[PDB]
Every structure is written in structure tokens, then in C-alpha cells.
Symmetry: C2
Subunit: 578 residues, 2 copies
């Protein structure tokens, strides 16, 4: 009771149709018979049934055309790296490595990738040579480089009949070829600069690219350690895919610096590392969670605060542009070919989206700092209730105590009138009364209570603060317009070779204007937040020591009254003696 | 060092130019010489200088074309009534009574009117007859009727050459003439129905119109009481301009009922009057200020609440339309002359603006009730702090007390061990300890404290309530469009005799839709407000009696400890005896 849901793809046996039973969601891809395949390859097709039973869409998204995220490429190395390790354990050579053969499985966010066109065709496959797994290595590092470039690793849009002949002329220690608009073929052993990656892993991934893209198949992934059945490629993948790196945005300078983490460094020696890095003293270096929880020093993207610095100035976030982009800043109206234009405009929307994530992370650190302020406020309310409570407890004990000793001095004075009492305990108890009247801490709790309601009024005022995310969605609109202009460029055929880019530069203008606005308002927010936070931190030991003094006069006075009791018991037993 | 500011008006001596010195704001109206007046009337003009040194714009506002407000017409009776009383003391007959001769002086809201065209020309002036102050009476009641009609009291837009001849045929006990579209001349001794006035004063003002507009000058204001140098007209003005009337919107039925106030009625007998009027029992009848302050019963537009009724239904505000307006409801597209159209459309915008003031006053009563809820919340916080404070005072006195008597039972037991103590006060003090342990009211303060934080959470939720005034400004836009359509009708010459009125009926549709919406949301608000208010009112005597019990165990326990003291003094003096 179901139908064909959607034609999934094609194949040598025929087209693939993904099915679904709407009453039961019976999802299955079934490669149908469309090609009328020869019976030899039909038997080999059922062999493929016994063995199989034994992404490019996301790439063509205009956001993704710049290159992918860090953890996306890392998780791609995990899924596809582990997958081809499993396949090379199973003696399998797919010969068909492409993002069109990558199924995306969203398990709650965990995008599990599985395995199921001449630029992925190896040059040994391009001329039908003896093959091995290094072919699939070549396509692997090919595709993973395309995950950050947005394009092929070698002479993009060159026809493979001579493009593979240029592949035969590659410097093997170099990894990337770029061609100028004059046709200048040059090489690079470096990554092209608009990435989204941190250099600390890029350089072992650079040498990894030096291994994975040598066109000699005996050298491509060649140093295979038979200790671990892996090349040095998979050694570096094992290192990097477990290489712990803490990324820290300096909130005070708007700078993210990554850090290699040795597997047993304490957080304090890390504070020494950031201390040497930034100059910020560890007593003033303050760090806390993404959710706004201060980091436990007892433990081994968190956000950097300087306690000893109060007012934070404007951003020290240098946000560069390329000389092509700067050339558009000089004149956006030059009529240049689209080979430049898709690249440069991708760098532009790339740049703007980078600014959006900058404000996004700064927005996060602001919210998290406000959460820490709320926790400090909560402890302030707890010590408030403790203070008011135990303070009025002290006041009542004062009242009851002195009225008690007033009655005791009346009757004791009547016994001194009877020639019974002694004047020494009389004067002593009058000193007890005088020291009780000295215990006049009931004004201090009202004054520091006025400090409490002062700061509580301040943080209630900080609740009603306006937010720059109002202009953050304006940045979303500007970036969205930039995406739309990139799409309108992207669907142009070769007849639309020359174009203008002025409105995008206007989006850059209003972008940096709005970003300066939300940074000024934002730094005003954080400035008042850390100010009132400092007021709370300075307020706490006063409340603590004062409450301690309350407990001092508490146990003091109770001991004094019990002393008065026992003295009356002494005069009792003395009168029992006589 | 100044110039002519603006030409104010005209005159027989010439045009009047209002001056101003921009550096000093030297405002003065100066009647210039434009007419080249004859020297006899120039000498009479300087006579007018010696005697003078001895509004129609507001009428033509489309809001005001329906008729003026209540207090506006009343203040007009005060200023112009008192002014012509002063002028008739000075033997002055102006002969020139018109709103064009009325200067508006805004003293902080108090619009002081002062004294400075054939429909205001009296029929005795129209035929140049012997004159008196009853001429200015005729123009006075003429203009004051025009303040509520928006038009002349007799056959509007009729040419005075025969319109005064129709004035000679007026029924003197009748006050108003209306003409049908067939030309049917009829009379009315009543006010035309679209007023803005309360009938309680209208009927003495109706007979006042029967006196002030009789075309016999010896009868117009004729019964002049020489006891007070006034006609019965000024007697009724003296009554009505001091006639105290409390206007009360029934919030429960969306109805305003006016009330004559005898000059010494207490507020309780007023509650009997509203009690007989509405059926609402005085124990449930609740009244409070415009600013949300409950009315003192000890004293002699406030808003009516029913305490015994919880959920208030939809409005019982009948808002009628005329049969002309209902005829437009039948078909707005009938092509009828503008003599109807300006009147009927004025009734329409009149109706919509009336609905706007309805929601405005209901909005006021909602805000005021919320203010009363805040005051109840404030008393709740005061009793909260008193309760928590004195409660923990009681707890500390319990602790100190029982530890005290624990020490006293230890030593007293040691003296019973010494063969000294008696068991009766032993067992008695153990009963004192047991009753102290019985005093376990520290859980009740936490439970009713949870009720306090419950209601505090509820009223904090009521703070974030959405407001129907969002659609109130939508009503402002709809009414503003209706004003614009009335203006576009109003500037039409006689060539635009036939018109359509459908979009105004659409404004009536969206008006009553939005009004039903804001009344539903509004009554939901007030329903939850009175509900939580009832919760607070029920919560209060629990807190009060519990706190009273705290004071009971307070003075009880203190008396018990002092009793224990005095008993030890008894054993002391007994041991002194032995």
C-alpha cells in the first residue's frame, strides 16, 4: 500500500528510486533497471547485492561555497576516514569516491556520513592503469580539500584531457595549483588563505596533503607503518582527530587564539600559558563557561575576562580583506570576468558571515557574563536573608537578655538591700549590660541593606537593557541580500561575463557601521555589568565579617547569661551552706 | 525692533493685525485703519478705545462638528455667562455676539474665553428695532445650541430674508426646527438626539432654551427676578454651573449613569443610591479613584466593581445608530444629497470616536484596578517582612529559651540530687519546655510564605500582560481615516452632490471587531486581576492572626522565663532564711 517516493539517483544497472510508505515511512533506496544491463554485469550486480548487503547538494549551498566549518571537516575525517579504514580492511576499492556518493544521516545533530565525473577519477583511472587504495586516497584528499576551497585542488574548470597532463607535471611537495587570469600556472605547498581552520592542525594537514596528493601511487600514502597497518596519513588522522584544542575568544581584545592541549595539563598551568600569551595576570584572568559557569581550577569555547581592567575599549578584531576585495573597494564598477567575480563575492559574503558569527559569539559571552552576574546576585540574596534573619535574631536576644538582667538587677539589688548580695557581680553584670548596649549592629545591617537594595535596583535596571541583536537580524538581512546577489551572479551563464558589485560594498558599509554600533552598545553593557559585579564582590566580605560578628555576640551573650545563671547557683549553694 | 506677526481680523475702522516682537513676544492685536472711516465714527472709534481700555475655527474642526464636550460647554457657560453678566452690569450691549468674537486663552488647560454675519443678527436687529440685552441672549442661546448641534438652531442654511420670517412663525415653547428633505418644516421642544450631554441638566437647559430663544424680546429672558438682578435663565445657570454630578462608569456592565448630588450626602447613602439603582449590594459594591485609590466612606469619574461577582461577561454597552445610519447599513451606495451626507457621516465618526473613548475609559479603569492590586501587593510585602522577621525572632527566642531551661534543669536536677530542689517546679518547668516545643509555627510561615511567593509570581506574570491599546491606536487610525473621508466630503462643492459611503461602513466593521477583541482580552485581564486580588484579600487575615499568635507566644515565653527567674529568687530567699 505504497508508491514511489522520489527517484534518488542513477547507476549502471539503472536509476535509483527512494521509496516511502506514508502510513509507515518505509524508506528504502531501490536501484531499478533502466539500462537493460548485460547478464554478465547483471550477475556482477547481484554480486554487488551480496557485497552491499554484506553532500554535493550541501556543497552547492552559497553559504558553503566558501568552505566548510572546522568540526564539519573533522567529523568528515572521522566518518569517511573510519569508513575507508573499514573498507580497506574488507579489501574494498570503491573507485567511485565523490560527495554525490555521501549519504548524510542526521542523528540529533551528529551528521553520520556513509559510503554508497572525471575530477574524482584518478589519473591512473583516467588512463586505466593498475590501481590500489591510493586512488581512493587521491580522491579523498581531493574532496576534503574541496570541502575548504569550494573547488577542485588543481586548476579549477580545466578539461581533464590536458588537466590530467598538468597533474603529471605537479610538484609533489606542493599541494595546490592556482592559475592567474593571464593563464599563469603556479603551484602552492600552502593552503589558499580563505579557510575557516586553525593553523595548529593545518600544518600537519598540510604535510598530510603533501602525502595524499602525490600523483605517484606508490608514494601517495606511501610510508605505510605495518606496526599499525596505516600510512603516516592515518597516523596524522589519529593524532588530529583526537587532538584536544581549547579555543578561547579574548573578550577584552575580540580575538580567538587556539591552543594545543597536552593530555594532562591542569587549568592553572593553562592560565600560565594564556598568561604568557596575553600578558593578563592569572589573578585578573577570568574564565567561565559557554553557559556562564566559572571554570573549576581543580579540573584540567570559553571566554576571557580581565578582572583588573574595568572599562573595555573598542574591538581589536582586525578583519582583513583580499587585494581583489580591496581592488573592489577601489572600484566596484570595473567590468571583469566572472571567474574572479564568484570567488571575490564569495569572499565578501564569507567576510560578512564571519562578522555575524563574531557578534554572535560576543553576544554569547555577554549573556554568559550576565548569567554569572545572576549567580552572584543569588548568593547575595542568600546572604541577605541570612543577614536580616540572624540579625533580627540577635536583636531579639538583646531585648530579652537586657530585660532579663534588668529584673535580675532589681531583685539582686533587693538582696543587697537585704544585706545578702555582693557588689562585685553587681558591677560585673552592669558591665555586661553596658557591653550589650554596645552591641548596636542593627544600623549597619540597614546601611549595607541599603547597599543591597542599591545593587538590586542596579541589576533590575540592567535587566531592561536594549539589545544589539535587533541589528543582528539586520545583519541577517544584509547577509541574506548578499547571498541573493551571489545567487544572481551564480545562475548567470557565460553571456553575463561583466558585472558591477557596488551594492555589496554598500552592504559592507552598513555592516561595519552596525557592527560598530552594537560593539559600542555591547561594551557599554559589559562595562556596567562588570562594574556592578565588582561592587557585589567588594560587598560580600563586609556582609560575611559582620555576620560573623553577629555570631560572636550571639555565643558571647548566651555564655554571659548562662554565666549569670551559674553565679546565682553559687550564691544558692553558699546560702545552702549557711 | 519688531514686525507685523499676523493679520488678526477686520473691522469697521479697518483690519486688525496681531503683532509680536520675536525677541520679547510682545503680543498685541492692533486694529489698523483700512476703511478710511468717517470722522464721526473715528471719534466713536476712540470712544471704543476708551471703553475697551475701560472659536469658530475650533467649531470647524471635524471632530467638533458633531458638538462639543460637556465640560467645554459648561466652561463656556461660565466664561461667557459671567462675562455678559459683567457687561450687563456695565450697561453694555455688544450687538456682535459670535464665536468669531471669542478669544481662547489656554491657562494650563483652563480655556478662558473673553469678549471682543446674519445668523447671529437678531430679528429685531435684522429689521432695525428697539434693542436690549435679550438680543444678546438670543445670540447666546443660539451659539450655545450651535456648540452641541454643530449648526444653527433654526432651519440650517436658509437665507435670512425669509428665514427670519420663519423665525416669526416659531412656536415659542418649542426650541428647535428641523426641515425634512421634502422641505417639511417641523418644530421640536427637545434637543436633537446626537448630543454629548447628560439629560439631568439637559431638561433645565431645555426650559432654559425655551426662555432664551423666544422671539418676543420682552419674553426672551423675561422673568427677571429683581431680587437677584437676573432672569430665571441666569438662575438656572447659577444652579447648573454649581450642580454637582458624579458620573460613574459601571465597569461590570459598561454603562455610565449620572447622578444628581445633594450638597451633603454621605458616600454610604450614595452607595445606597447606586445600590437601589443597579442592584449591587454595598458589601460587594466597590468603588475607587480615577488614579486607583479606594474611596473613603468617611467622606461625602469613579468606577464600579462588584466584589461578589468574579467572572465578568461581555459588554452591556448598547451603542445605537440612527435610522439614517441604519439606512446606510442597508445600502451605503445610495446616491443621496450631501445635506444628509455631512450629517450622517458626522454621526458615524461621532459614533466611532465615542467607541474610542469607551475603550479609553475602560482602559483607565483597568489600569486603576491594577494600581489597587499593586497597593494590596505592597501591604502584602510589608506583612511579609514583618512575618518573616518576627517569626525568626520567635524561633531564636525559642532556641535561647529552651537551651536556658535545659541548663536550669541540669543544675536544678543537681540540687535535687543535693536534696534541695522540689519536684513541683521541676515538672512545671518540664511542662514549660514541652509547651515551648509545641510552639512549632515555623512551618506555617514557610507554607504561607509559599502562598506569598505564589501570588507574587502571579502578579509578576500579570505584569507581562499584552495590551489592547495596540488595537486602540488601530482605532485611532480607523477614526483618522474616517475624519479624512469626512474632510473629503466636506470640501466638496455642490457639484459633488451624490456619493458612496461603503469604506466607512467597513471602518465600522473592523471597529466593532477590534472592540470585541480588546474587550475579550480586557475582561480576561480584569478577571485574573480580581481573582488574584481575592486571593490576597483571603490571604491577609491568616497572616495577621498567625502573627498575633507569634506575639502571644512571645510575651507568653518571656513571662515564663521571668517567672522561672522569680522562682529561683524565691528559693534564694528561702535559702537565705535557713
Amino acid at each position: 500500500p505504497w508508491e514511489m517516493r522520489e527517484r534518488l539517483g542513477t547507476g549502471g544497472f539503472g536509476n535509483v528510486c527512494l521509496y516511502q510508505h506514508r502510513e509507515l515511512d518505509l524508506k528504502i533506496a531501490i536501484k531499478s533497471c533502466r539500462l537493460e544491463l548485460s547478464t554478465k554485469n547483471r550477475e556482477r550486480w547481484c554480486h554487488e547485492i551480496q557485497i552491499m548487503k554484506k553532500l554535493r547538494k550541501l556543497l552547492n549551498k552559497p553559504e558553503n561555497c566558501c568552505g566548510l566549518k572546522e568540526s564539519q571537516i573533522l567529523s568528515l575525517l572521522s566518518d569517511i576516514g573510519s569508513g575507508i579504514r573499514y573498507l580497506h580492511e574488507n579489501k574494498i576499492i570503491h573507485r567511485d569516491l565523490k560527495p554525490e556518493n555521501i549519504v548524510l544521516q542526521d542523528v540529533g545533530g551528529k551528521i553520520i556520513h556513509k559510503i554508497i565525473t572525471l575530477q574524482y577519477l584518478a589519473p591512473e583511472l583516467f588512463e586505466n592503469k593498475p590501481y590500489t587504495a591510493t586512488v581512493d586516497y587521491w580522491s579523498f584528499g581531493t574532496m576534503v580539500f574541496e570541502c575548504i576551497a569550494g573547488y577542485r585542488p588543481f586548476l579549477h574548470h580545466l578539461q581533464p584531457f590536458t588537466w590530467h597532463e598538468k597533474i603529471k607535471k605537479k610538484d609533489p611537495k606542493c599541494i595546490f595549483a592556482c592559475e592567474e587570469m593571464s593563464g599563469e600556472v603556479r603551484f602552492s605547498s600552502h593552503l589558499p588563505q580563505p579557510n575557516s581552520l586553525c593553523s595548529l592542525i593545518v600544518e600537519p594537514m598540510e604535510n598530510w596533503l603533501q602525502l595524499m596528493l602525490n600523483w605517484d601511487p606508490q608514494q601517495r600514502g606511501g610510508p605505510v607503518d605495518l606496526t599499525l597497518k596505516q600510512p603516516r596519513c592515518f597516523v596524522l588522522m589519529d593524532h588530529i582527530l583526537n587532538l584536544k584544542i581549547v579555543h578561547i575568544l579574548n573578550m577584552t581584545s575580540a580575538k580567538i587564539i587556539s591552543f594545543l592541549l597536552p593530555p594532562d595539563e591542569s587549568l592553572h598551568s593553562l592560565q600560565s600559558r594564556i598568561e604568557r600569551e596575553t600578558g593578563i595576570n592569572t589573578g585578573s584572568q577570568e574564565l567561565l563557561s559557554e553557559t556562564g559557569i566559572s571554570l573549576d581550577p581543580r579540573k584540567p569555547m570559553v571566554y576571557l575576562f580581565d578582572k583588573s581592567k574595568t572599562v573595555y575599549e573598542g574591538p581589536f578584531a582586525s578583519r582583513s580583506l583580499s587585494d581583489c576585495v580591496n581592488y573592489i573597494v577601489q572600484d566596484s564598477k570595473i567590468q571583469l570576468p566572472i571567474i574572479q567575480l564568484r570567488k571575490v563575492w564569495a569572499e565578501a559574503v564569507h567576510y560578512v558571515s564571519g562578522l555575524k558569527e563574531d557578534y554572535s559569539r560576543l553576544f554569547q559571552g555577554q549573556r554568559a557574563a550576565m548569567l554569572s552576574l545572576l549567580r552572584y546576585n543569588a548568593n547575595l540574596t542568600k546572604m541577605k536573608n541570612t543577614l536580616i534573619s540572624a540579625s533580627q535574631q540577635l536583636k531579639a536576644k538583646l531585648e530579652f537578655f537586657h530585660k532579663s538582667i534588668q529584673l535580675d538587677l532589681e531583685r539582686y539589688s533587693e538582696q543587697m538591700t537585704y544585706g545578702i548580695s555582693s557588689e562585685k557581680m553587681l558591677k560585673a553584670w552592669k558591665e555586661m549590660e553596658e557591653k550589650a548596649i554596645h552591641y548596636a549592629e542593627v544600623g549597619v545591617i540597614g546601611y549595607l541593606e541599603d547597599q543591597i537594595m542599591s545593587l538590586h535596583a542596579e541589576i533590575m535596571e540592567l535587566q531592561k537593557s536594549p539589545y544589539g541583536r535587533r541589528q543582528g537580524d539586520l545583519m541577517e538581512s544584509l547577509e541574506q541580500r548578499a547571498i541573493d546577489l551571489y545567487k544572481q551572479l551564480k545562475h548567470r551563464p557565460s553571456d553575463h561575463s561583466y558585472s558591477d558589485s557596488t551594492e555589496m560594498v554598500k552592504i559592507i558599509v552598513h555592516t561595519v557601521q552596525s557592527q560598530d554600533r552594537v560593539l559600542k552598545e555591547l561594551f557599554g553593557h559589559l562595562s556596567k555589568l562588570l562594574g556592578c559585579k565588582q561592587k557585589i564582590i567588594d560587598l560580600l566580605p563586609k556582609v560575611e565579617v559582620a555576620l560573623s560578628n553577629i555570631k560572636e555576640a550571639d555565643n558571647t551573650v548566651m555564655f554571659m547569661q548562662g554565666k549569670r545563671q551559674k553565679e546565682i547557683w553559687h550564691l544558692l549553694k553558699i546560702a545552702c551552706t549557711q
